[PDB]
Amino acid sequence: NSIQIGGLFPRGADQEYSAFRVGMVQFSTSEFRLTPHIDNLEVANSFAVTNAFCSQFSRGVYAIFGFYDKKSVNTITSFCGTLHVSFITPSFPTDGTHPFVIQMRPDLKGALLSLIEYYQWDKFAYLYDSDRGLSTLQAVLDSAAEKKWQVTAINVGNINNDKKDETYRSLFQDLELKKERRVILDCERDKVNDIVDQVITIGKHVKGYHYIIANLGFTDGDLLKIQFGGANVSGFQIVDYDDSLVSKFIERWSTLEEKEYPGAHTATIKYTSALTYDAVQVMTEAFRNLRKQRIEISRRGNAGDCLANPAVPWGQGVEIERALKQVQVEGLSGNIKFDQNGKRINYTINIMELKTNGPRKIGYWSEVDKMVVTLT
Amino acid sequence: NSIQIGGLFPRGADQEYSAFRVGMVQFSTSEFRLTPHIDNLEVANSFAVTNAFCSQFSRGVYAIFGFYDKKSVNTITSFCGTLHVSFITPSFPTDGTHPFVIQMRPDLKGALLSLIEYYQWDKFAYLYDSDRGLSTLQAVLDSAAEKKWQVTAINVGNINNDKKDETYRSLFQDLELKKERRVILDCERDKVNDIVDQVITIGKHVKGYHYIIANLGFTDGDLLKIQFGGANVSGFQIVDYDDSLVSKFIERWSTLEEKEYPGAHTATIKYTSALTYDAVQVMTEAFRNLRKQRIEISRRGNAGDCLANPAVPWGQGVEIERALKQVQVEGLSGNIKFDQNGKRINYTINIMELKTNGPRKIGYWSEVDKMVVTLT
Amino acid sequence: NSIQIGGLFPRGADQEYSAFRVGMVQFSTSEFRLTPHIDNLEVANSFAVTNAFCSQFSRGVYAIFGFYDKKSVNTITSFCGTLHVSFITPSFPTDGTHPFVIQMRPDLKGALLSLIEYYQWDKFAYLYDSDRGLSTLQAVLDSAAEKKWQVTAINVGNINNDKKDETYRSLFQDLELKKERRVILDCERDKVNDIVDQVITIGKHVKGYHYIIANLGFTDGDLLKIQFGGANVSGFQIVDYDDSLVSKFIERWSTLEEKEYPGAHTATIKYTSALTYDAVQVMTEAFRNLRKQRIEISRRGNAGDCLANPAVPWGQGVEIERALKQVQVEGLSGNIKFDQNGKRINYTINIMELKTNGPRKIGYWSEVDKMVVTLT
Amino acid sequence: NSIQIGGLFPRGADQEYSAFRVGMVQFSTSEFRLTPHIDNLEVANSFAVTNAFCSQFSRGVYAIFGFYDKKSVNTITSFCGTLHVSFITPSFPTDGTHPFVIQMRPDLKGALLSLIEYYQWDKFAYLYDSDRGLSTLQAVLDSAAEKKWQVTAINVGNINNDKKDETYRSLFQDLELKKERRVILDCERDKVNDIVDQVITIGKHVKGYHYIIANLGFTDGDLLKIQFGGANVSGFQIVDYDDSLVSKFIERWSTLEEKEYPGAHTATIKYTSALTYDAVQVMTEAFRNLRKQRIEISRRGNAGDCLANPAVPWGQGVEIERALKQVQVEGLSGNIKFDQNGKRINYTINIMELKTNGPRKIGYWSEVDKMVVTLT
Numbered sequence A, B, C, D: 001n002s003i004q005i006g007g008l009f010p011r012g013a014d015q016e017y018s019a020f021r022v023g024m025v026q027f028s029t030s031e032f033r034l035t036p037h038i039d040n041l042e043v044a045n046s047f048a049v050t051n052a053f054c055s056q057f058s059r060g061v062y063a064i065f066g067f068y069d070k071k072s073v074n075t076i077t078s079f080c081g082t083l084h085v086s087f088i089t090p091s092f093p094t095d096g097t098h099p100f101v102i103q104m105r106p107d108l109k110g111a112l113l114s115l116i117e118y119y120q121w122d123k124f125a126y127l128y129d130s131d132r133g134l135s136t137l138q139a140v141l142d143s144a145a146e147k148k149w150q151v152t153a154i155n156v157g158n159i160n161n162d163k164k165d166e167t168y169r170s171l172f173q174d175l176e177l178k179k180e181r182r183v184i185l186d187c188e189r190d191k192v193n194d195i196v197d198q199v200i201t202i203g204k205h206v207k208g209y210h211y212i213i214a215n216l217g218f219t220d221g222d223l224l225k226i227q228f229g230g231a232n233v234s235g236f237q238i239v240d241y242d243d244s245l246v247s248k249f250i251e252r253w254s255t256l257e258e259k260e261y262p263g264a265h266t267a268t269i270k271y272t273s274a275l276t277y278d279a280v281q282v283m284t285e286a287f288r289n290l291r292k293q294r295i296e297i298s299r300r301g302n303a304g305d306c307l308a309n310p311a312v313p314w315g316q317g318v319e320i321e322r323a324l325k326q327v328q329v330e331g332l333s334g335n336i337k338f339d340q341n342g343k344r345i346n347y348t349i350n351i352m353e354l355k356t357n358g359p360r361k362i363g364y365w366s367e368v369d370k371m372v373v374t375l376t
């Protein structure tokens, strides 16, 4: 027995594809071995996204895995919820109840606001980028209205790379006029690193300036260049490198070569690749549970084409969705439990601060609890 | 000769389709005869949008007219820019330079900020809706950062109809705590009408309050219920009902029947329908200019399909885009000139206020000029 | 046996006729069977009223039910007192002791003045209408002479529908000059509804204002549009919807159909219909008491005609009047006891106010007692 | 040739019937002599009013003359406007556009308010009686609202004759508390005389107390008993005893006996009888004009009965109405001109003050002009 699936990896996700392969070979069980068909493309081009989607749909697959941006999430959700096709993705969640989508990246607004109100903040800033959405921004604004805050929102995505230095320096210069020393950074690795570069240039890495990285790869970025500025730097983490299974995976990972497994001969791993690993795990577990449910869902014939008018769903797809949304395991990120829509639940988000002795966890967060303090 | 085009209209665009037909029958001529191919659908469904686009592309069209939304704009832009197929639309303009897309709805952030600084505001509120994007909100915030303002942003898009009453009344009830007497409404006609209903129900249309309808359909809404409250009100109107050709069109319009041309036996008209009329005008003018420039665009063969790998555009698409962007005429909205990106320029936006007698034009805004007031 | 009566209902008394039929079918019994003879007409036309009266008198009726107005009350009273034919009516009671007329609508001047002195008013306004007379106005004035008040009386009866808007808005506009924030509305349901519409349109339902609905149909009007304005409101309600038999009647009432019993598939009921129900009740009780007292009333011969000169009454008319005035039962309006003149006594009028949650009974007024407040 | 008409005179209108006969014999022209059928009755009993009306309608008459009170005006207006029958009356006018009615008593609100504002009044009283209506009261109240006055309205009609002295004395006693010396009296001869008696009893006839009699018989009442109190007494007049025709009529009138012409051996005459005279005159003139219009309107057959269902008008009645409403002569009251409704126009109202030398005219009033001052 075998299975046909699809992989939508953007040009440049070498580490993510490496982790995908590592998981496919680790969880490989002769009882049922999967057979994917990768398709790399510009993920921000809905045209190519739909091309690959229809290719993998006609290929006769049951589930699809891949990323998406704020320019293709709508396309993906529509196509999936129409053709009743499960789509797994670590990319940012969706601002709605989009079915047939398995969002592995947990939420962040909760822990972010918890940390904020824990540091007792009332006037700060928020530098955002539209590369992921504006749900965090909307949550921040509503919490400010309900908390009597004074936010200073700014966008740093439309700013090209040719005038970045001049612009950023201008923003940091005209920011001190309001005596604003505390700051937030809702951007990806590239943007946060460019911003830290501009910061070290202006020399604002001195103490009194607090910084929050509103992502999960607090350890993936270049940090040692500002760890000595005495600044109040913080950040979140989703992977805990000090656990049994994650440490074993890291041992098996760093010892790999950068030729047959690019972006894999390191001690740290991107949370995106960790979630790709966990996604391989959960897909294997769901298909195994189906195999153990005394059910065969082999497509009767060719699945068809996207443009089939009218639509042409198949209930066994709903069964696959229900199976995927009924999993509970422990992966690199931790307890992986889902809800009826697809979002994650009952997860852990380790908080981290940058101290002279390196990053140090100072507690965790969850949905049932508020922020916790562990480091005495 | 004859020409074939496409049409994408939502479920409920009766007035817009009527205006489209009116323009088709008015601007027609023996020179060329358009051959539309209408296709109604849920414009917020990317799958249906792709289906309609591919149908009208296989039909062998030379251009397309239609609307879009926050959940289909990226799909439309990608498909057009890839297939080199133009696409006219009055919907909210894109946040970038997307080729092969003719935007008819001019920008609003400039005039809005000019009006705000004219009224000399420093602490107000902003009610937005996830219907046309948050470009206006982002601009308001990134300009408040430099204008020393205190904004209070709120969303009203995720509100259901059963709880709309209790929710709206809670908003303004909370705003009393902050002493918020000045407000901005960046919402659609129905949403602003519901907001105004709740406002008058609560008793806030009385003097001491100010409101701003952040849209071009100022008169498009029902203001008679808030005209005699004594509260400041302001807005924008892209069509000046006191002009020659617009008055002639209104004469030909109100006289018509609500049977063959629904939403037509009235003196008011929605800016969406006005822009539809102007769109038909500019398309006819462009095709006439092309046929007059001793040119040939007729497709030698068929179009194939969207998913033809690799993508295969056709040459005359660039010429058609250059034509549609090389137009300078006048219509309901006023002068109609586009830039390389396709957005409008050298346009005017008449500012208005709600007096006890009726809404009068206090001034107008431009791109090369600021908010020119009219003291009279 | 059977009994024949008459019925005079205006053009539009659907709810009242429905309540009449409901009472006829409810209070019926094998003891006696009523035999109504309905006759609709313009109640404000004395000629038509005389025609109907003479028709139903020649028909050989033993009593009559029906309404009247300021232009027919004298006709009805004279005809009845001359022919010794009783006449039940919920319409406004007469300004005197007119025999053979059973008034069901209890007085209001006492409770109104008690409420006024309870709120401690000294300078207010009074809007009246030439629809039920000016007894309330005359009493208000002759009591202000002794209470040291400053009244501002205004009429709204001679206002047409085309100019109602501009006229109503002019009234309250002029009242601002006198700083008139307290008001009384002695008008019908439709008139008070129009007044309230114009009030909310102008922005005077906000705090700092007080209103009093000088009628028993407090809930009969639409208050949801003025409930959340923040302005004081008060009124009277003769039917307490929170009682056993009234609740049972409402259960039997709302369940009914709007086809056979129009204006019946609702939980609210107009005091006119309630008094119609109570009128049927008391008439049945009186005829049963008569048949039980070993009496005979059946007319030996016909009735002749109204204009029989000289007038020739019949003896049992005085007995029927004594019976109808010798009744003491309970119904929707409450206890039902009459005096020698025929007006009601030992009744109750529940005072009410408009709270944000709903209209609650703050107290009640009586004849032998004053305005008993309920602090709870 | 002859004519049949009707006369509705209340029991006690001996002087009015005498004047009626005097006019019928004076204007008696052999060209056409009228033949009335008098019918005395209690004018405040609509039953008897309708009885007499139907009697004179079946008798085969063309026009009707008589009085009415505030308890029969509606009956009269309805019957007339229904059967299209002209009704002449000196009684108080109607508060509406009641057709087929000839109101000979001019208006009074105009001249009353003119005199008031001429004496420069701002705080006074108003003692009214419902024996005529409340139009004067409503006019006074609206003029007060539009003039910033402080009126003190009081009713003295409901007060029986057994407690009149005690009540009146109480009102005069508790009136001085507001320092109210100026007073108005809107009552008939009996009530005004009783009030003057109570006044002379209390001794309030001293100067400083002003009094206005809001009727036209300022000279018909008992005045010499208070003419010496030095009070500021005023009053209106409609008849000027110092003119040619009126003086000749008085000469022919006083010389008559009180046996064949009761209430006629005097030097003064009631304005009601003067208007009866003028009504005889105008009816004769209208019938003469019809005779001179080459038209015969003899009823084809028996006119029928009131209760004829449906109604049974006749256009020649409309012709009679148009003829009566197209007269212009000079009678005891002066220029008698009518309007489309029936009211009078272009008349004179001589004002009068009570001085030690007796009543003295001090000007006049009209509809085209305001109050005038003649007595230097």
Ligand SMILES: *[C@@H]1O[C@H](CO)[C@@H](O[C@@H]2O[C@H](CO)[C@@H](O[C@@H]3O[C@H](CO)[C@@H](O)[C@H](O)[C@@H]3O)[C@H](O)[C@H]2NC(C)=O)[C@H](O)[C@H]1NC(C)=O
Pocket (backbone or CB within 6 Å): A119, A120, A181, A182, A207, A208, A209, A210, A232
């Ligand atoms: C950077 O991080 C350090 C912790 O490593 C922060 O230290 C402490 O900051 C808190 C927050 O302000 C202080 O608490 C407060 O004291 C102020 C004094 O007026 C009071 O108003 C607050 O309500 C609160 O109680 C705390 O005393 C302070 N202690 C030490 C040893 O630093 C530091 O504030 C952070 N700086 C920035 C710019 O975020």
Ligand SMILES: *[C@@H]1O[C@H](CO)[C@@H](O[C@@H]2O[C@H](CO)[C@@H](O[C@@H]3O[C@H](CO)[C@@H](O)[C@H](O)[C@@H]3O)[C@H](O)[C@H]2NC(C)=O)[C@H](O)[C@H]1NC(C)=O
Pocket (backbone or CB within 6 Å): B181, B182, B207, B208, B209, B210, B232
């Ligand atoms: C509604 O609109 C009216 C007029 O458009 C506003 O009246 C305006 O109120 C502002 C502030 O109260 C006035 O500005 C101030 O004027 C004084 C001089 O009186 C000056 O000393 C201050 O420095 C400031 O400039 C403005 O003059 C006044 N406009 C007019 C025509 O009188 C009103 O405030 C608006 N209401 C709301 C709730 O927005």
Ligand SMILES: *[C@@H]1O[C@H](CO)[C@@H](O[C@@H]2O[C@H](CO)[C@@H](O[C@@H]3O[C@H](CO)[C@@H](O)[C@H](O)[C@@H]3O)[C@H](O)[C@H]2NC(C)=O)[C@H](O)[C@H]1NC(C)=O
Pocket (backbone or CB within 6 Å): C181, C182, C207, C208, C209, C210, C232
């Ligand atoms: C609407 O109703 C409320 C309450 O029913 C009214 O509040 C009432 O206002 C009056 C006058 O402002 C208060 O009377 C005064 O109270 C003070 C003590 O605060 C006393 O010294 C005065 O001699 C006088 O009695 C009354 O207490 C107050 N009621 C409550 C419960 O606070 C309000 O005025 C009404 N508004 C209108 C427009 O009628």
Ligand SMILES: *[C@@H]1O[C@H](CO)[C@@H](O[C@@H]2O[C@H](CO)[C@@H](O[C@@H]3O[C@H](CO)[C@@H](O)[C@H](O)[C@@H]3O)[C@H](O)[C@H]2NC(C)=O)[C@H](O)[C@H]1NC(C)=O
Pocket (backbone or CB within 6 Å): D119, D120, D181, D182, D207, D208, D209, D210, D232
């Ligand atoms: C009774 O009638 C006599 C006329 O025969 C009135 O005489 C005059 O009354 C007028 C009205 O008040 C006086 O005019 C005023 O003088 C006051 C003084 O403060 C002024 O405030 C007014 O604006 C007006 O100009 C007039 O002087 C006075 N003259 C005489 C010789 O009496 C009398 O007032 C009447 N009394 C009453 C109680 O109606």
Ligand SMILES: *[C@@H]1O[C@H](CO)[C@@H](O[C@@H]2O[C@H](CO)[C@@H](O)[C@H](O)[C@H]2NC(C)=O)[C@H](O)[C@H]1NC(C)=O
Pocket (backbone or CB within 6 Å): A329, A330, A335, A346
């Ligand atoms: C939520 O997730 C936690 C993850 O720890 C669940 O709890 C424990 O589950 C892990 C496996 O994920 C076991 O190894 C542990 O023995 C469990 N107990 C403890 C104390 O760690 C937990 O059951 C999940 N559910 C809820 C409702 O919290």
Ligand SMILES: *[C@@H]1O[C@H](CO)[C@@H](O[C@@H]2O[C@H](CO)[C@@H](O)[C@H](O)[C@H]2NC(C)=O)[C@H](O)[C@H]1NC(C)=O
Pocket (backbone or CB within 6 Å): B328, B335, B346
């Ligand atoms: C911008 O638009 C204006 C119209 O608002 C245009 O100028 C008018 O164009 C006509 C020709 O169609 C000229 O005759 C007028 O003189 C122009 N207006 C003025 C004030 O001169 C034109 O398209 C643009 N004009 C400018 C100055 O940019």
Ligand SMILES: *[C@@H]1O[C@H](CO)[C@@H](O[C@@H]2O[C@H](CO)[C@@H](O)[C@H](O)[C@H]2NC(C)=O)[C@H](O)[C@H]1NC(C)=O
Pocket (backbone or CB within 6 Å): C328, C335, C346
């Ligand atoms: C006035 O009306 C009341 C009802 O509001 C009546 O009294 C109730 O009548 C019942 C008999 O039907 C008695 O059992 C109750 O005791 C009465 N009420 C009270 C408080 O005692 C009755 O018709 C009149 N009562 C009075 C006191 O006038």
Ligand SMILES: *[C@@H]1O[C@H](CO)[C@@H](O[C@@H]2O[C@H](CO)[C@@H](O)[C@H](O)[C@H]2NC(C)=O)[C@H](O)[C@H]1NC(C)=O
Pocket (backbone or CB within 6 Å): D329, D330, D335, D346
């Ligand atoms: C209004 O009535 C007057 C009454 O005097 C009319 O005028 C005079 O009419 C009388 C007859 O009624 C004549 O004897 C006079 O010769 C007329 N003139 C004068 C100066 O008295 C008058 O015509 C009527 N019409 C209007 C519009 O006022």
